[PDB]
Amino acid sequence: MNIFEMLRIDEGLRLKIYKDTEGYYTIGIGHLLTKSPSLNAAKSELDKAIGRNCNGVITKDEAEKLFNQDVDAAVRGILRNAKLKPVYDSLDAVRRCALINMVFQMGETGVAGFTNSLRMLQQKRWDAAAAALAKSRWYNQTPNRAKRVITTFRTGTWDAYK
Ligand SMILES: [Cl-]
Ligand SMILES: [Cl-]
Ligand SMILES: [Cl-]
């Protein structure tokens, strides 16, 4: 199991613009297009991102390319962020994927707001970290995915995904 397979399980793959759980226009493997209500705005963003007139539809390859970009961008933002970097450095490999999962989903700023959870993980207090992470809108809105990520942090294994 690797980060790409983990996220493909959590986000799915769709080749036509769809609305995410929050109602925003997305495509491929959890690639957010725009927060805007406009489908046209979405289509414009999409074309800008692919480099061609897509008319709301992309290929598998195109979807994987966006995914390669987003995962890379998530990892590099972690490494650049003063709050995230030290947590990431302190973690084992599996747990590292779990942080990358959160960042891909909610962005760097979002994850960086989880002050106490961050501290608990840096301290390797797994159980405490799992409990704090659960007290969030994130957990309440997408409980199945959140539980899977939380279990990855708690155990340090890929059990939740197997
Ligand atoms: Cl927290
Ligand atoms: Cl709550
Ligand atoms: Cl969910």
Side-chain angles (χ1 to χ4, degrees), residues 114-117 132:
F114 280 78
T115 294
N116 175 76
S117 298

mmCIF file of all heavy atoms in Angstrom, residues 114-117 132, ligand 1:
data_model
loop_
_atom_site.group_PDB
_atom_site.id
_atom_site.type_symbol
_atom_site.label_atom_id
_atom_site.label_comp_id
_atom_site.label_asym_id
_atom_site.label_seq_id
_atom_site.Cartn_x
_atom_site.Cartn_y
_atom_site.Cartn_z
ATOM 1 N N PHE A 114 -4.772 21.934 13.592
ATOM 2 C CA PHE A 114 -4.999 20.867 14.527
ATOM 3 C C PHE A 114 -3.815 20.836 15.538
ATOM 4 O O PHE A 114 -3.070 19.867 15.658
ATOM 5 C CB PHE A 114 -5.169 19.571 13.662
ATOM 6 C CG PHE A 114 -6.525 19.306 12.983
ATOM 7 C CD1 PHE A 114 -6.934 19.947 11.824
ATOM 8 C CD2 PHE A 114 -7.371 18.311 13.483
ATOM 9 C CE1 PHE A 114 -8.146 19.604 11.222
ATOM 10 C CE2 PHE A 114 -8.594 17.970 12.920
ATOM 11 C CZ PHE A 114 -8.987 18.636 11.766
ATOM 12 N N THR A 115 -3.654 21.948 16.269
ATOM 13 C CA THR A 115 -2.584 22.178 17.215
ATOM 14 C C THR A 115 -2.278 21.050 18.188
ATOM 15 O O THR A 115 -1.174 20.502 18.235
ATOM 16 C CB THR A 115 -2.810 23.538 17.887
ATOM 17 O OG1 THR A 115 -2.650 24.518 16.878
ATOM 18 C CG2 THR A 115 -1.806 23.748 18.995
ATOM 19 N N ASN A 116 -3.280 20.668 18.945
ATOM 20 C CA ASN A 116 -3.135 19.615 19.944
ATOM 21 C C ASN A 116 -2.849 18.223 19.352
ATOM 22 O O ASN A 116 -2.005 17.487 19.852
ATOM 23 C CB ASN A 116 -4.342 19.652 20.923
ATOM 24 C CG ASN A 116 -4.404 18.524 21.965
ATOM 25 O OD1 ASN A 116 -3.672 18.517 22.948
ATOM 26 N ND2 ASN A 116 -5.304 17.572 21.778
ATOM 27 N N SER A 117 -3.608 17.840 18.324
ATOM 28 C CA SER A 117 -3.401 16.553 17.619
ATOM 29 C C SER A 117 -1.951 16.492 17.150
ATOM 30 O O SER A 117 -1.326 15.459 17.242
ATOM 31 C CB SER A 117 -4.257 16.400 16.367
ATOM 32 O OG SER A 117 -5.620 16.412 16.676
ATOM 33 N N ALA A 132 -8.229 13.317 19.842
ATOM 34 C CA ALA A 132 -8.378 14.708 19.510
ATOM 35 C C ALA A 132 -8.805 14.901 18.068
ATOM 36 O O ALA A 132 -9.584 15.776 17.740
ATOM 37 C CB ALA A 132 -7.075 15.472 19.714
HETATM 38 CL CL CL B 1 -6.348 19.398 17.571
#
